[PDB]
Amino acid sequence: MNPLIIKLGGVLLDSEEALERLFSALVNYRESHQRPLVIVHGGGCVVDELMKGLNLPVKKKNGLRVTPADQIDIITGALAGTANKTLLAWAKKHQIAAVGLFLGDGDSVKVTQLDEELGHVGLAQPGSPKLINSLLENGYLPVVSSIGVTDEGQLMNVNADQAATALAATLGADLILLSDVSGILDGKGQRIAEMTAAKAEQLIEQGIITDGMIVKVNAALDAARTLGRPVDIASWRHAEQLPALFNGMPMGTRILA
Amino acid sequence: MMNPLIIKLGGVLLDSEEALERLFSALVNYRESHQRPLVIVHGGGCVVDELMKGLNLPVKKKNGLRVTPADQIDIITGALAGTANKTLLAWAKKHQIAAVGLFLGDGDSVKVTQLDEELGHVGLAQPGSPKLINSLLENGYLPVVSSIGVTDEGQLMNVNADQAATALAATLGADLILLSDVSGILDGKGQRIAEMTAAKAEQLIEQGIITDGMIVKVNAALDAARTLGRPVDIASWRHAEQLPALFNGMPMGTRILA
């Protein structure tokens, strides 16, 4: 099979129950299926707690965080270091041969600076699949953080949904955005298995999709629009359904755009 | 057949723009004239210390060595396996070097057990599996390995970088250079001792000739040579002029012989 990228939301990373369930599911799946799996992740709450711990206020510019030179190293530490190695420790506990990467390893996802005024915020672009392909061929589970690096050597914090999207494009991989949202329910409360961009847009306005659901649905829509194939929204809550989902079944809500 | 060279980094180097620039220039120079592949191992230098200061966290010792509390291993892992590692990867990318950042647990490259209940999450390194790193080397990548590890039960561990590098050296069958901010150890005629036996180095420490907090550094090289059964070089990262010659087998610092 073509590779699958499983992107983990921060709320998943901040929950030991989610993580235990996830890694148990990963073990179960791999005992019956050889599909190449890649994990992508961001920071979760560990960046924000570190920043608060260091009394470094976060400034925003039009909704995006200014990331000066004097914060990018701290952030890199929390996200490429703590979050990534926490995942690798979970992997090890479950006897899974994982390898931690960031976007710059093998130029897997190329990153340019988004805006001089935001400092070290990066924009993801598809990169080179060579390194990750070689790891997958050898039976490793790459676990890739959303820190990247420009070609000139400047570290960048990259939106993890976009990072995962760029990596999926790079690898010709499928994409699941996994978090606490198990699927988008219709106006009668039934999970919608497959959802076009037309339904999504209608449902938001109609008021069925509101709150954080809006941002998560939009995250998926952007990812599908770029990728040219569907992107799944799913949760860890019904852990038994994860192998099916990893095999390509729309156990969540599949977004088509 | 491969005979990789591990260059271990730490201390103030990891935070000096000029030093890193000259270090990486030397890496590129050696790589241009040699097929023998390189591996970097590194500790956390000033990066960990700096973060500890900013969080107002005390650094406590016990047997001489530093305690790594359960409530601090995540922060330390961040500074070391995150910041220091990726800083080095950024310098690699600046210098067009295809590098891959690793920690000790990746491919079980260096196995780790908890050293002491009282030190908390401080790890004792032992040789692991060379398969992952060997494959990376054969494919032309430069592995850059931090000194964080993980126990088989999944507990993160901070490992002495000198001992982590030694265990990796055993694992890969590698030559080993410990780069630190060191001076030459002089004999009674005031000339730098370029090579000395683990037996001699041990004696010079015993007889007070080996001055300063170099005792810790020589002890590290000595233990490495005895474990490895091959010579281990201690050298300065200053005067990076001499580094390619150093990498090319010349004893430009102080070699502890087997």
Coordinates of C-alpha atoms in Angstrom, one line a residue, chain A residues 85 88-89 91-93 96-100 140, chain B residues 81 101-112 125-126 128-129 132-133 145-152 155-157 159 164 168:
Chain A
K85 CA 10.7 12.2 22.2
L88 CA 9.2 7.9 20.7
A89 CA 9.0 6.8 24.3
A91 CA 6.6 3.8 20.7
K92 CA 9.4 2.1 22.7
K93 CA 7.1 1.0 25.6
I96 CA 7.4 -0.3 17.9
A97 CA 10.6 0.6 16.0
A98 CA 10.0 4.3 15.6
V99 CA 12.5 7.0 14.3
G100 CA 12.0 10.7 15.2
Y140 CA 10.7 2.0 10.7
Chain B
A81 CA 17.2 16.4 22.0
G101 CA 18.9 14.1 13.7
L102 CA 18.6 11.1 16.1
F103 CA 18.4 10.4 19.8
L104 CA 19.9 7.3 21.4
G105 CA 16.7 5.3 21.3
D106 CA 16.2 5.6 17.5
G107 CA 16.9 2.1 16.2
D108 CA 17.9 1.2 19.7
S109 CA 21.3 2.6 18.8
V110 CA 22.4 2.9 22.4
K111 CA 20.4 1.1 25.0
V112 CA 19.8 2.7 28.4
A125 CA 24.5 3.7 28.3
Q126 CA 25.3 0.3 26.9
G128 CA 22.8 -1.2 21.1
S129 CA 22.0 -2.0 17.5
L132 CA 19.7 2.1 11.6
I133 CA 22.8 4.3 11.7
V145 CA 22.7 12.0 17.7
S146 CA 21.6 13.7 21.0
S147 CA 22.5 12.1 24.4
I148 CA 18.8 11.6 25.5
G149 CA 17.8 7.9 25.6
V150 CA 14.9 5.8 26.6
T151 CA 14.5 2.7 28.8
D152 CA 12.9 -0.4 27.4
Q155 CA 11.1 6.3 30.5
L156 CA 13.2 9.1 29.0
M157 CA 16.8 9.3 30.3
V159 CA 22.8 10.2 29.6
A164 CA 26.7 7.9 25.2
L168 CA 27.7 4.3 20.2

